[PDB]
Amino acid sequence: ACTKNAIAQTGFNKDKYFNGDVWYVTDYLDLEPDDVPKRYCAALAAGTASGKLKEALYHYDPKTQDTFYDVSELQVESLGKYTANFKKVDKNGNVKVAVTAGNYYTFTVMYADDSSALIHVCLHKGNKDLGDLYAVLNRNKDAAAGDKVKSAVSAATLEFSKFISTKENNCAYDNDSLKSLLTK
Numbered sequence: 001a002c003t004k005n006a007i008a009q010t011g012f013n014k015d016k017y018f019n020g021d022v023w024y025v026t027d028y029l030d031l032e033p034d035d036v037p038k039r040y041c042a043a044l045a046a047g048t049a050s051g052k053l054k055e056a057l058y059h060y061d062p063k064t065q066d067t068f069y070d071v072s073e074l075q076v077e078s079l080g081k082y083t084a085n086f087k088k089v090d091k092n093g094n095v096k097v098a099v100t101a102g103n104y105y106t107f108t109v110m111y112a113d114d115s116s117a118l119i120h121v122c123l124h125k126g127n128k129d130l131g132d133l134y135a136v137l138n139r140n141k142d143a144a145a146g147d148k149v150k151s152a153v154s155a156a157t158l159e160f161s162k163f164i165s166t167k168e169n170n171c172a173y174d175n176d177s178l179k180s181l182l183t184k
């Protein structure tokens with residue numbers, strides 16, 4: 001189960017974050033021992049499509065090759081805090097698993113600037129018992145975490161040294177699919 005009420009960034013700039021561009025996960029911290037492997041790659045695009053706040057997701061496990069995309073319409077809880085009812089889709093937006101009761105995530109944007117972000121995610125999916133996840137994002141898939149985002153990790157009373165990097169997984173992303181999924 002999740003245990004954190006993450007606090008959103010003071011002065012969060014939603015239009016800059018939700019600009020339709022891609023964010024790559026560079027580092028992550030899963031609070032429950034084994035909800036996820038020590039290497040999925042992940043990326044997302046977030047934006048407004050025909051007036052609707054949307055987020056598209058990509059996951060890839062470079063060892064198993066397990067791959068999946070999702071798209072969600074987002075609902076607002078407060079500035080920087082959103083609820084996402086996800087649908088599993090192929091890379092072209094064709095539905096594989098419809099929106100389902102019990103299938104949603106919340107996320108909180110704890111820190112963001114033009115190039116980097118720190119988010120909290122609480123995923124709910126069927127009968128899995130999942131815990132809190134934190135992720136450091138960058139607009140550049142190769143960027144080492146800089147001082148603004150690392151300081152934000154500290155300010156959340158977390159230790160960046162505990163975060164697991166995705167950089168040695170050598171993941172390659174279909175950015176075009178993420179951006180186009182925002183409309184689907």
Ligand code: HEM
Nearest residue numbers: 025028035036037039040042070086088105121123128135
């Ligand atoms: C970027 C922020 C992330 C968000 C919003 C997110 C969200 C989600 C969602 C919605 C699902 C279920 C998708 C579906 O069933 O259609 C999922 C599954 C999963 N995610 Fe993430 N995720 C993120 C990052 C990560 C990271 C960095 C990892 C690293 C290991 C990870 C590991 C997993 C795993 C292992 C599953 C499979 C869960 C299961 O079915 O048991 N996710 N995630």
Ligand SMILES: [N+]
Nearest residue numbers: 036121123133
């Ligand atoms: N996840």
